[PDB]
Amino acid sequence: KTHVQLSLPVLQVRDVLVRGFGDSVEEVLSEARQHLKDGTCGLVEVEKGVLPQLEQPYVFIKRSDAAPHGHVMVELVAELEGIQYGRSGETLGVLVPHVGEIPVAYRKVLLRK
């Protein structure tokens, strides 16, 4: 399938134990997709002071469309030193590994895989 319905655990930035997916734009996008597939991916909602607490490169989920079965359609965009790789809509949050942190909510998304 080109798209997959996922329910992403929303984590508080100060709870996150593993604060990025790796060391290159290509690696973080790769790892993010693997974790999304394995159900081991969390979402941090971006506000003032969140991103500097996480590790670059960042992986964003961004709205790709204006929501089948409650699931907002999203795609992945990476960022490193203020350059983005991809072009998409509004940020829903930054993806991080989920290693058992207790979430505050779930974000239902339809991921272009």
UniProtKB/Swiss-Prot annotation:
Compartment annotation: Host cytoplasm
Organism superkingdom: Viruses
Domain spans labelled CoV Nsp1 globular: 2-113
Region described as Disordered: 1-113
Entry function: Inhibits host translation by associating with the open head conformation of the 40S subunit. The C-terminus binds to and obstructs ribosomal mRNA entry tunnel. Thereby inhibits antiviral response triggered by innate immunity or interferons. The nsp1-40S ribosome complex further induces an endonucleolytic cleavage near the 5'UTR of host mRNAs, targeting them for degradation. This inhibits the integrated stress response (ISR) in the infected cell by preventing EIF2S1/eIF2-alpha phosphorylation upstream of stress granule formation and depletes host G3BP1.
Protein name: Host translation inhibitor nsp1
Organism of provenance: Severe acute respiratory syndrome coronavirus 2
Location of this fragment in the whole protein: 11 to 125 of 7096
